[PDB]
Symmetry: C2
Subunit: 358 residues, 2 copies
């Protein structure tokens, strides 16, 4: 019996920051309206492609683990906002970092995608030859947004987080997990007309709907994550009080609170950074994990509960048993290219087109 | 030790057929030019979305295996042409078929994606709780093509293939596999400007380049598949002559022939259907497997070698040990919706725009 220890962690938040005040200059919103409704104060807007965010997060995780490019046998990029479909963007991260031969694929399960990727990499390593893996959640959600619709435009942001996993005989890393999907929730969170469903030669094809039915998402998310977390805990043999830290998807602080309340988990165990970055889909969990470690929230031998949901409606939970080390082996100097524009300036073309079309 | 037997197989080829003669009515080609160069006589053009092709193939595989919707715990759709990015299309197949709760994700590794999906599902089943899985390769490549460029427009088509896997103690299904990626080949097969790299509000954004460097693809494909097949065989303990059937990606018959020649595998062991369907990316292997079974090419207890490559440049090989049954348990009556248009008529808008832009 083998395990996949989380030996490296890293993040990449692009520098250009879009404040609530910035949003209020082109939408009928206020900092007060956005913060009360969402708990978000800021979010990041990338000046580079998704794959560039993924690359920097990966570099940080690699330095954190001290692994070489030869040692990496598997790369998974969890994303719903890839630069390209042909080829995938895991191969772009691979090209950028000069990693030979590793399997490289993109995994799409919306914001549950990092958890799906962690589950997938862990089992691949347990059942076959893979010695180390790189699992990245990376998104440029700002690509998708309808800048005339305040209820969705204020929720989402860009960023990436990564881990490195290393094979070990010690009982650490992801233990049990339950991942799933409530396909009866498929239509309540969706961009149905970006993809091959869209008309390639319709001049109005950029003005797609971003469907978001908040009350239904809340209900299905709490149900799906809750039952997954229960299945994992029940199988683990831990009592609820033995969970030390919760690392949740960052969609909505009230969902996190309801999840913990219904499970009987103390509210102060859940790591929250939604106020800084908004909902970055697949990136939420790995950024939160990296920052929890940075901030001293996770101790050696802690039990972590990971919980996430996303469009699909995908869902999942996982139990991680931490090992000995909570400190990076090395730091990376890796940085994104210079950002020469403010967030408002980055978004200008899209905002202007969305308004004109309206 | 558990295994993932292939208990169901199925396919969906959309009915609208684009002949070489059809292509010669709008391109500077002839049936003679296309056939001599490519070995392709026909290909299919879908009148429906990728997810609809995936659904029908899945229905056939499900009837073939006799599994219920409750029994299915995992759905992977291997595709580079999904209807949507938010949500994924595995969740659409799940919705269409009323499969509760199963994990559902899209996997992008270009034409090697079905093999990646088979590897992934098999190891998930071996290392954790998943009892049955649905793995689908499905593509609508016709969405992407530059109808003014004869060297690429004649190569690609649409379709889907599926398998059902079932957990067993018997040593059957995928045994060893080696999947990988030569990221030095990333730029020789690519559509860099469909995805979030594209300008959403550029009116010319539909007129993207389809990069295809044939000689370089050939070289890297033979190298990558060849070495993967060798690693699998060497680890298997089989001699080369003990491989009964080869199920290869259908990109180019000369690649298949070179692969077998260099490995010392008899040419008549490789199943070929490229003449009927062209290159359907992730769908090639599962359609070929389904048709090999249909046509009596695979016997109980055969050793199969699967080999594939795709944009990335992704690559892989796998050894499958067949079990007892090569016959479906049941047939499905599932059909696509009525196709009211010829292939030429389906493509008319895109051809006309590509020509006008030129
Ligand atoms: Na504990
Ligand atoms: Na044999």
């Amino acid at each position: 019996q083998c395990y996949a220890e989380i030996t490296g962690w890293g993040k990449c938040l692009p520098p250009a920051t879009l404040s609530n005040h910035d949003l209020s200059t082109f939408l009928d919103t206020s900092d007060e309206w956005i913060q009360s409704r969402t708990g978000i104060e800021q979010r990041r807007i990338s000046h580079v492609n998704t794959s560039d965010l993924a690359t920097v997060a990966a570099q940080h995780a690699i330095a954190c683990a001290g692994v070489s490019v030869e040692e990496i046998d598997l790369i998974i990029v969890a994303t719903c906002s890839p630069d390209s479909l042909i080829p995938n963007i895991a191969s772009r991260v691979q090209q950028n970092l000069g990693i030979p031969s590793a399997a490289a694929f993109d995994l799409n399960a919306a914001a549950t995608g990092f958890l799906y990727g962690l589950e997938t990499a862990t089992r691949l390593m347990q059942a076959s030859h893979y010695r180390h893996a790189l699992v990245i959640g990376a998104e440029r959600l700002s690509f998708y947004l309808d800048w005339t619709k305040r209820d969705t435009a204020v929720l989402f942001g860009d960023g990436a987080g990564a881990v490195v996993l290393s094979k070990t005989e010690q009982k650490v890393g992801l233990q049990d997990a339950q991942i799933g999907c409530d396909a009866q929730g498929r239509d309540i969170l969706a961009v149905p007309k970006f993809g091959t469903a869209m008309d390639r030669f319709d001049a109005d094809n950029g003005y797609w709907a971003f469907d978001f039915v908040g009350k239904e998402i809340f209900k299905r998310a709490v149900r799906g994550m809750g039952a997954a977390a229960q299945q994992v805990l029940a199988r683990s043999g831990l009592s609820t009080e033995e969970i030390d830290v919760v690392i949740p998807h960052q969609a909505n602080i009230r969902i996190i609170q309801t999840l913990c309340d219904l499970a009987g988990i103390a509210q102060d165990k859940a790591f929250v950074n939604i106020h800084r970055y908004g909902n970055t889909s697949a990136a939420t969990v790995p950024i939160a994990l990296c920052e929890a470690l940075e901030q001293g929230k996770i101790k050696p031998h802690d039990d972590l509960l990971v919980a996430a949901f996303g469009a699909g409606l995908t869902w999942g939970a996982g139990h991680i048993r931490w090992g000995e080390r909570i400190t990076p082996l090395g730091k990376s100097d890796a940085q994104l290219p210079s950002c020469d524009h403010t967030a408002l300036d980055l978004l200008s073309k899209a905002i202007e087109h969305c308004k004109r079309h309206q």
